[PDB]
Design a protein around this ligand. Structure first.
Ligand code: SF4
Ligand code: SF4
Ligand code: SF4
Ligand SMILES: [Zn+2]
Lengths: 23, 37, 13, 118, 26, 53, 20, 221, 126, 4
């Protein structure tokens, strides 16, 4: 891709952890 | 009220041209909740 | 935080 | 239901469209009104922290509140900003919530008629 | 709910792709 | 055409520099509950995205 | 970061949470 | 009612300030396009045309035709609201017809988010200072068509990255209210580093009040 | 002009109203790519997924942050999320405007006889 | 006074 499980995705994760918790 | 029109007739009336009604049941009413464990 | 009794708490509350 | 208009941003020009010939709120008895001799206040448009005291003051001198638009509802596009009140519920008690950004003049007409039913 | 989780709104129908460009990536 | 601003007073509330690279949501909310200011607490926090390839 | 009672969001109280 | 929205008489503006310019810095170039319809909410397409022109740092263009339709929409509002300070109804019927044109081309009567950097979102349906194909054939800037996105791997990759991350990246126009310009500072990332919005009404505001057609969504941004 | 509301004003197949989650001709179409959430210019979409296939456990849309711009419908690579034709879903409380996966799926199950003909009318311009 |  880098440019003519199913738990989280790379962009939203801080860093891993998302929202305080990482065919 | 306008929400009484079935979706099939909603297209025709607005000149746009598992299924699945129920009108606006606010004031069923939908109450939100977490859909996760 | 996260008719006159409505602006008192958050959503739900 | 003589409404006093708090026209803040774009929701305001979608509600002056409902008094336009096509929708004509006056035919329902809902008149483009004046000094808060008004029954329902339509918070249409982003409420800023700077303006929230004014909104509460005009609420106090007035009754029902209809919240038009995502901004007035829960902040909308500007919810995460330091200058905007995340919703007008935090300032005034709201009776009807008209979603959309902006909601269509027909949607606000629906909100007004549902307030009439209330 | 189908996930398993203040009426409690619960959908009842517990769950290229057909249609050509109306489906999913082939 | 960074008046012109830049205040970033011409744009901020009375007694409030936001456009400094200052948290997005700020430091204080406003509620009735007058109208009073309180430390900012978001029901949902802004989810910082790491988009740079 | 606690969980919102109504929708289960990730609430916060630190303004500088997303300051990078 | 003749406060033109929110005005404390200088003019103590700040009643419609929402930190738009700061929020644009936290959102990619596509996510920031809707922010430009909500500035002069009587000149939505003209507002989002200047942003598109600036971004195209980096076309459809239909953009000039809809900019002229938007000029008519804005001038109707300006003249009729000036008179009201209601012909307002007489010409707001025509404004409603134009809103129907907007909705037929984009899907929303006011905030279309239609004129995008690279051209316009979709084709016309088989359609009508300063008070009434259709997009660049570069799938690294403009998203590919949905049919190609579901049949071609490069198109799917580009559709994925242009909507999650975006594309890696003053300009003034004659908006119906004056010179609407944007000073855009990119950076080199997928999000703008800085976005200053020169609004025609800011300098003009520095009972008109009606003849300067002041919209507070742009004086405050 | 005056029309007799609630005869209703003209709209187009591209109208951007109430959102709905859709299904294949029973299985849901959302495979939880999170591209609608990533694009959502108002951060109105909170998604959580788990194996389970790859389907969402949480799929929420905050109609009070949403600017109703259709970007999610456009970002979705499977036609699962969409703006429905419904513009008459006004509520009496704020909480009813914070949708859920169940609310959105019920919206997609109620408005499907119309959000499937509108797409067929407009899918060739997309 | 129109708000204050
Ligand atoms: S809800 Fe949308 S249309 Fe209404 S004031 Fe906010 S940005 Fe403008
Ligand atoms: S609705 Fe579509 S874009 Fe959003 S997570 Fe599901 S499949 Fe992905
Ligand atoms: S229409 Fe736009 S603002 Fe609303 S949920 Fe979809 S992407 Fe987000
Ligand atoms: Zn398949």
């Amino acid at each position: 891709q880098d440019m003519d499980a199913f738990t989280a995705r790379p962009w939203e994760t801080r860093k891993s952890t998302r929202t305080g918790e990482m065919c | 009220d306008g929400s009484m029109v079935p979706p099939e007739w909603h297209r025709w009336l607005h000149c746009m041209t598992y299924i699945w009604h129920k009108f606006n049941v606010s004031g069923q009413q939908y109450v939100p909740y977490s859909t996760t464990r | 935080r996260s008719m006159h009794l409505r602006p008192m708490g958050d959503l739900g509350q | 239901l003589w409404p006093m208009t708090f026209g803040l941003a774009c929701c305001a020009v979608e509600m002056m469209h409902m008094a336009a010939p096509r929708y004509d709120m006056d035919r329902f008895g809902v008149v483009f009104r004046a000094s808060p001799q008004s029954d329902v206040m339509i918070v249409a448009g982003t409420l800023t922290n700077k303006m929230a005291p004014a909104l509460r003051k005009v609420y106090d001198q007035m009754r029902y509140v209809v919240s038009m638009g995502s901004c007035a509802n829960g902040g909308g596009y500007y919810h995460y900003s330091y200058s905007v009140v995340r919703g007008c519920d935090r300032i005034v008690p709201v009776d009807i919530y008209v979603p959309g950004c902006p909601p269509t003049a027909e949607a606000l007409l629906y909100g007004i008629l549902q307030l009439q039913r209330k | 709910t189908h996930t398993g989780q203040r009426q409690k709104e619960v959908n009842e129908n517990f769950a290229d792709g057909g249609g050509g460009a109306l489906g999913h990536p082939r | 055409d960074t008046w012109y601003e830049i205040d970033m007073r011409i744009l901020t509330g009375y007694g409030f520099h936001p456009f400094r690279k200052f948290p997005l949501s700020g430091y204080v909310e406003l509620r009735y509950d007058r109208v009073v200011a309180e430390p900012v607490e978001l029901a949902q926090e802004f989810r910082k995205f790491d988009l740079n390839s | 970061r606690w969980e919102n009672p109504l929708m289960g969001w990730s609430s916060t109280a630190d303004p500088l949470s997303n300051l990078v | 009612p003749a406060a033109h929205g929110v005005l404390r008489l200088d003019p103590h503006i700040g009643l419609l300030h929402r930190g738009t310019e700061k929020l644009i810095e936290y959102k990619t170039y596509l996510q920031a396009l809707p922010y430009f319809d909500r500035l002069d909410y009587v000149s939505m397409m003209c507002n989002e045309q200047a942003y598109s022109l600036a971004v195209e740092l980096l076309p459809a263009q239909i953009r000039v035709l809809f900019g002229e339709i938007t000029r008519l929409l804005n001038h109707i509002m300006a003249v009729t609201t000036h008179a009201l300070d209601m012909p307002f109804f007489w010409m707001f019927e025509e404004r409603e017809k134009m809103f129907e044109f907007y909705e037929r081309v984009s899907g929303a009567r006011m905030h279309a988010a239609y004129i995008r950097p690279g051209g316009v979102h979709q084709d016309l349906p088989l359609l009508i200072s300063g008070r009434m194909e259709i997009k660049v054939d570069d799938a690294k800037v403009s998203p590919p068509k949905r049919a190609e996105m579901k049949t071609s791997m490069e198109s799917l990759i580009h559709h994925f990255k242009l909507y999650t991350e975006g594309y890696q990246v003053y300009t003034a126009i004659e908006a119906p209210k004056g010179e609407f310009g944007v000073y855009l500072v990119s950076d080199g990332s997928s999000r703008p580093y800085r976005c200053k919005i020169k609004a025609p009404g800011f300098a003009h505001l520095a009972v008109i009040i009606g003849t300067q057609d002041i919209v507070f969504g742009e004086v405050d941004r | 002009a005056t029309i007799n509301y609630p005869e209703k004003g003209p709209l187009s197949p591209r109208f951007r109203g109430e959102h709905a989650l859709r299904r294949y001709p029973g299985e849901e179409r959302c495979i939880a790519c999170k591209l609608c959430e990533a694009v959502c210019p108002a951060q109105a979409i909170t998604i959580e997924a788990e194996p389970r296939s790859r389907r969402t456990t949480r799929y929420d849309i905050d109609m009070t942050k949403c600017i109703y711009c259709g970007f999610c419908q456009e970002a979705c690579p499977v036609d699962a999320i969409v703006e429905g034709p419904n513009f008459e879903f006004s509520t009496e409380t704020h909480e009813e405007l914070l949708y859920n996966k169940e609310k959105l799926l019920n919206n997609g199950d109620k408005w499907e006889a119309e959000i499937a003909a509108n797409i067929q009318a407009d899918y060739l311009y997309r | 006074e129109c708000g204050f």
